[PDB]
Amino acid sequence: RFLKVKNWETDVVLTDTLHLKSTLETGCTEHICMGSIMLPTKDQLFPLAKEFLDQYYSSIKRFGSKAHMDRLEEVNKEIESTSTYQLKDTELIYGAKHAWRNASRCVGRIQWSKLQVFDARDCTTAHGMFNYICNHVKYATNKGNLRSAITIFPQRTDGKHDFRVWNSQLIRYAGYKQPDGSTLGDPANVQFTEICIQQGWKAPRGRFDVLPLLLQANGNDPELFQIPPELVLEVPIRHPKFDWFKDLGLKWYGLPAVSNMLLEIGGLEFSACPFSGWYMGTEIGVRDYCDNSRYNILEEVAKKMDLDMRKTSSLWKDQALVEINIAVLYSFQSDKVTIVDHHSATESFIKHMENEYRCRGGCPADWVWIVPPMSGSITPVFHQEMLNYRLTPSFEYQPDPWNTHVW
Amino acid sequence: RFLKVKNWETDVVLTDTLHLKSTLETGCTEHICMGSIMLPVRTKDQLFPLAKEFLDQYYSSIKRFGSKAHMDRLEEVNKEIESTSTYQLKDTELIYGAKHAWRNASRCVGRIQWSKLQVFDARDCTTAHGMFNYICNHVKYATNKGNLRSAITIFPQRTDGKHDFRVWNSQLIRYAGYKQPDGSTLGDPANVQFTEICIQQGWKAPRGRFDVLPLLLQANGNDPELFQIPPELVLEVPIRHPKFDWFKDLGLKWYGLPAVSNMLLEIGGLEFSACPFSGWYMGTEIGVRDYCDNSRYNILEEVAKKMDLDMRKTSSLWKDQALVEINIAVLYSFQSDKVTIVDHHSATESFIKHMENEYRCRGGCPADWVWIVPPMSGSITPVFHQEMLNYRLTPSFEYQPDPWNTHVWKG
Ligand code: HEM
Ligand code: HEM
Ligand SMILES: Fc1cccc(CCCNCCc2ccnc(-n3ccnc3)n2)c1
Ligand SMILES: Fc1cccc(CCCNCCc2ccnc(-n3ccnc3)n2)c1
Ligand SMILES: C[C@H](O)[C@H](O)[C@H]1CNc2nc(N)[nH]c(=O)c2N1
Ligand SMILES: C[C@H](O)[C@H](O)[C@H]1CNc2nc(N)[nH]c(=O)c2N1
Ligand SMILES: [Zn+2]
C-alpha cells in the first residue's frame, strides 16, 4: 500500500502514498502492463465536487471549516437545483494549477504553481474566443521571454454546446500532399490543413505556413481566423559551427501551446482550455524535425555533413541528430527566446520529484514520456523509478472534434 | 479478449491473444502502473499443474498433443512427483524449455535469435570444479574466436533449496572494482562488493582498471570456490576510434562475451538456479551504460575534454556529442577485430520484424518498452514508436537474491 521508488544512479528511495488517492483507472492489470500504450448526471457530479472542494479547503488550511461546510452546502444546493455548478475564481485557479501538477506526462512541472490562468468563462462566440486566444498568445510569448498560461472557455453543459479549439496546438505549420506523392510541410497536419481549406482557408502551400485557428463556440460550426503574424514569434534555425546549416531553410515557432485537451475540475469539463509553457529542445529537434512521419530531415542533414551513410553502424543518424539539436538550442538562445535543454529539464524534474515526495507524499509520472527521446541514460530521469497513476483535477484527451461534430 | 498494439510511425496495428496464457503477475493494478519499477522450497501441491501446463505446451509445439506419447509422459511425471516429489526433464524438454525462456524474456531485444541457442546440459555436475570445467567449455564454445554463438549451460535444479547450485558472479566475465581510501573507485564501480568477497575468499587482486574477475562457484549448497578463467579463453577488444587517434590513449578495452550468470530458469515448475547464458553485445550496452553511466566507468568528462567541446554549459550538448563518439568507437573496435557486435539501429529494426512475426505465428510477443528502447537516440529507432504489451509467460528467466545475502556458510 505504501510503495518505494528508487533512483538506481543515486540510491535515493522515496515512499509514495499519494497514489492511494488515485481515482481513475490506468489501463494495466496484474496480468498485463499497458505502460507503453499511447491511449489505454447529478448523481456522479456531487461526489466529484465534494472530493474537489475537500482538497481545495484543505490546501488553504480550512478543512472542516464553516466556510468549507457552507461551500459544499451551496454547491450541493446548486447541483440539485441546476444540475451543474459554477467554480469560484479561486477554485478555478487552484484547479488549473493542480491539473498541471497532476499531468504525469509533463516533464516541466517544477513550474506548476506559476501559471497565469485567464478566465474566459464569459466568452460566447468564436470571435470572442479568437480575441482571448490572441491575448493569451501575446501574454505568454512576452517578446521571447515566455510565461506559462492557460485560457479557460465555458464548461460543457449538455454536450450540444461545447467550446472547442479544432487545432491541436494554437501554432502549427500546415501539411500538403503533392501529386508527386510526397508531403510538403508538416505531415502531422495534412488532414487538419484539408479541413481548413474545405472551410475556406487560402493556403499559400509552403513548407512553414502558420495554420489558421478553427474555433467553435457553443457548439456552432467552427470559424477561421489568422493569428496576427506579428504575434507569432518564429526562430530561423542556424548552427554555431556549420555555416551551410542555415541554407536548409528551417525555422520553428517559439510558443508551445496545446489546445486540444479536456480539463476536468471537480467533475466539471472544460473542453477548450488551450495552455502553453516553453519548449524543451528535443521536442523540436528530435521529434518535430527527425521523426520519419514529421519533417524527417535526418537524411538531408547527414548529406550536408558528408557522413558515411552506407552502414547504420557508423552512427551517422546519431551524429546528425546531435548537431540538429545543438542548432535548435543555439538559435532560440541567440534570438533570446526561452528554451530548455533535456539535461536541464530532467534535472529540474528530479528536484521537483523530491519536493513532491516530501511535501505531498508523491508525484505521478510516466517514465515512457518523461525520458527525452535522445540520450535517455545520460539524463537522470532514466535512472529514476516512477509510479504512474491518475489524480484529478486533470488534463485528459478527447476525440478530434471533426469526428463528433454534427454539422 | 483481443488486445491491439499500434505502431505510430507506420500505422501497423497488431492483435495480441497470447497474453491470455499469462499466469504470473506484473506488479501493476488498475490504479497504478509499475512499468518502470526495476523489481516490481516448492511443494508437490503446486508442482503437477505446472508440469502439466508445460508438457501440454511441449507436446503442442511438436504436433503430438494428446498423443499416447503425450499421455504416458504426464502419467510418468505425475508418479515421479508423488513418489520423489520433484521430477526430471527429458533433454528434448530442457532444450525446448531454455529456448522458450529466452523467447519469453520481455526485456531482451535480441530475441529474433531465440531458436538458435546451444544448450549445454550440465545436470550431471556435482562439484565446483565440475562447474568451472562446464563454464570454461561454454566460454570457449560461445566465443568461437570472435564469431559469437549463443549458448546456455544448465546446472542441476533446486531440490530442497538447501543444495542449490549458484554462480556468484553476475556475469561470467566482468572487471574488478576497488574502493580507494580517498573515496574514488578503481575499475568498475558496479563490482566493488563482489570484488571484496573475492578478495576475502583468497583472490590475489592485481588492482588495475580492467582485471577480469575470478569465478566464484557454488555446487550442491556448499561454500563457493574460486577459479580463474584461463586468460587465453578471455577475448578482449582494445577501444580505438576511426577518426580520433588519442582515443586509444584513454586505455579502454572491453571483453567480447556478454554472459548473464545470476538468473534463475524456471521450466515446468522446476527451478534452475545456475544457468549462465550468453549472446553477443549491442553496442550501447558498453558504449552508453558500461562506459558513461555516472555509477560505472563514467568517461564522458575525460572524452569531451579531449574533444575540446565547450563544457561550461549542458546546452552545448557536449555530453550528447562525446556519447556518440564513444559509441562509434566501440562498434568500430569490435568490427575491426572481427568480434560479433550489433548497433542499436540494426538490433531494434530486427526486433520489430521479430515482434511482427511473433504476432502472426504466436498471437503475441511480450515486450518491456522501458528496457527494449535503447539508452541513446531512442526515437530514431523504430522501437520507440512501437506500442508493446508486457506480461509474464513461462518458461522464464527470473531474478533471484544475491547468494551472499542468503547463503548459509559451512566454514
Ligand atoms: C513551462 C514549461 C513546460 C515544459 C518544459 C513542459 C514540458 C513538456 C513535455 C516535454 C511534454 C511532452 C510533450 C510531448 O512529447 O508530446 C509535456 C507534456 C505535457 N505538459 Fe508540459 N511543459 C511545460 C508547461 C506546461 C503547462 C503550463 C501545462 C499545463 C498548464 C503542461 C501540461 C502538460 C500536459 C498535460 C502534457 C501532456 C500532453 C499530451 O499528453 O499530449 N505543461 N510537457
Ligand atoms: C543473441 C544476442 C543477444 C542480444 C543482442 C541481446 C540483447 C539484450 C539486451 C541489450 C538486454 C538488456 C541488457 C540490460 O540492459 O541489462 C538483454 C536482456 C536479456 N536477454 Fe538478451 N540478448 C541476446 C541473447 C540472449 C540470450 C542467448 C538469452 C538467453 C538465452 C537472452 C536473455 C535475456 C534476458 C533474460 C534478459 C533480461 C536480463 C535482465 O533482466 O537483467 N538474451 N538482451
Ligand atoms: F497519446 C497520443 C496519441 C497521439 C497524439 C498525442 C499527442 C502528442 C502531442 N502532445 C503535445 C505536444 C505539445 C506541443 C506543444 N506544446 C506542448 N506542451 C506545452 C507544455 N507542455 C506540453 N506539448 C498523444
Ligand atoms: F531489475 C534489475 C535491477 C538491478 C539490476 C538488474 C540487472 C541488470 C543487468 N542486466 C544484464 C546485463 C547483461 C550483461 C551481459 N550480457 C547480457 N545479455 C546477454 C544476452 N542478453 C543480455 N546482459 C535488473
Ligand atoms: C509507443 C510509445 O508509447 C510512444 O512512441 C511514445 C513514447 N514516448 C513518448 N514520449 C513523449 N514525451 N512523447 C511522445 O509522443 C511519446 N511517444
Ligand atoms: C528506473 C528504470 O526502470 C531503470 O533505469 C531501467 C530503465 N531502462 C533500462 N533498460 C535497459 N535495457 N537496461 C536497464 O538497466 C534499464 N534500467
Ligand atoms: Zn503497467
Short mmCIF file of C-alpha atoms and ligand atoms in Angstrom, two decimals, chain A residues 367 382-385, chain B residues 36 38 289 370-371, ligand 6:
data_model
loop_
_atom_site.label_atom_id
_atom_site.label_comp_id
_atom_site.label_asym_id
_atom_site.label_seq_id
_atom_site.Cartn_x
_atom_site.Cartn_y
_atom_site.Cartn_z
CA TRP A 367 8.60 7.22 -17.42
CA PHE A 382 16.35 7.38 -16.95
CA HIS A 383 17.66 6.02 -13.69
CA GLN A 384 14.63 7.13 -11.67
CA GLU A 385 11.78 4.67 -10.98
CA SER B 36 9.36 1.48 -14.71
CA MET B 38 13.09 -2.48 -11.83
CA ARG B 289 25.86 2.13 -19.95
CA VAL B 370 11.36 0.72 -20.87
CA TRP B 371 14.07 -1.86 -21.47
C1 LIG C 6 14.25 3.05 -13.37
C2 LIG C 6 14.37 2.38 -14.73
O1 LIG C 6 13.32 1.45 -14.96
C3 LIG C 6 15.74 1.75 -14.92
O2 LIG C 6 16.69 2.80 -15.05
C4 LIG C 6 15.84 0.92 -16.19
C5 LIG C 6 15.40 1.81 -17.35
N1 LIG C 6 15.55 1.10 -18.64
C6 LIG C 6 16.56 0.12 -18.75
N2 LIG C 6 16.74 -0.56 -19.91
C7 LIG C 6 17.76 -1.48 -20.06
N3 LIG C 6 17.87 -2.12 -21.23
N4 LIG C 6 18.58 -1.81 -19.05
C8 LIG C 6 18.43 -1.15 -17.84
O3 LIG C 6 19.21 -1.38 -16.86
C9 LIG C 6 17.40 -0.19 -17.68
N5 LIG C 6 17.21 0.41 -16.47
#
